[PDB]
Design a protein around this ligand. Structure first.
Ligand SMILES: [Mg+2]
Ligand SMILES: [Mg+2]
Lengths: 30, 132, 132, 30
């Protein structure tokens, strides 16, 4: 029922996915 | 209200050090704005990082928080255009970038404070949302 | 109608090799769109290089060409997001970057050919403007 | 007094302006 819980479930689920691309920016270039 | 920069929502979804605080901040404020362009940037970075399933998390997140995507109008871009002269990055100035411009732009016009992670918006003239 | 990209207008203002032809195409179609974000990226690049007075020339060109700055809506951002997975400038391959997405989205949603300079938009599911 | 000639006018002025920051690596690597 609280929102921070719902957003933490998404966070936890999303953070544990396999990292198919490791570099940060230069995925965003310019 | 508040405005969400990509730096925060990427940090939250990637479960970065201060994630739960941003989640509280989000919860404290009933209306939550995000620039259609900030949305894009975010989707680009996550869907590169975690592929499409990462992208599906972003959409749920956006639907769960009831975020209002605001279109990038000219006046936002104008505001950003000026801000980049003063605050934009250079040789060792550590200020704004092109992505940041759209978050800056939306905050300035709306008059609302911004939620972000990093230096980019530390020394600017718009209000920040304070973490609890 | 046409959509104008940052790569074109910056070319037309820096006096790059093809400039003269790019102007001709602009005259050939009267109704001209440009995404507010491509306008910004152009403003940033120009005003970085030639200072604020370069920006005054950018503003005159837009006025003189009667260019309609179209706001970036969610629909444009959605098509940009999906497109990027296919045509994105990943490792080793040319293609769209964050900025390009904004003209691509406008071009994709409007369904109007795009005028640009370089390789980014070549192999892509949107129409190019023919260069006379 | 056609539109081609007006855009050209604007081009030559703008390109004739002094450079104050060099080529496009400044918006801004990211
Ligand atoms: Mg940003
Ligand atoms: Mg572009």
């Amino acid at each position: 029922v609280p929102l921070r819980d719902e957003l933490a479930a998404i966070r936890h689920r999303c953070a544990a996915l396999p990292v198919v691309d490791n570099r940060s920016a230069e995925a965003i270039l310019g | 209200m508040m405005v969400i920069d990509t730096s925060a929502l990427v940090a939250m979804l990637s479960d970065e050090p201060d994630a739960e605080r941003f989640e509280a901040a989000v919860e404290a404020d009933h209306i939550r704005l995000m620039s259609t362009a900030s949305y894009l940037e975010t989707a680009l970075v996550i869907e590169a990082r975690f592929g499409e399933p990462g992208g599906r998390e972003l959409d749920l997140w956006l639907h769960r928080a009831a975020v209002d995507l605001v279109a990038v109008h000219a006046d936002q871009a104008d505001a950003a255009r000026a801000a980049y002269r003063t605050y934009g990055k250079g040789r060792h100035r550590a200020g704004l970038n092109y992505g940041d411009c759209f978050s800056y732009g939306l905050a300035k016009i709306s008059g609302q404070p911004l939620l972000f992670k990093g230096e980019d918006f530390q020394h600017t003239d718009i209000a920040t949302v304070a973490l609890p």
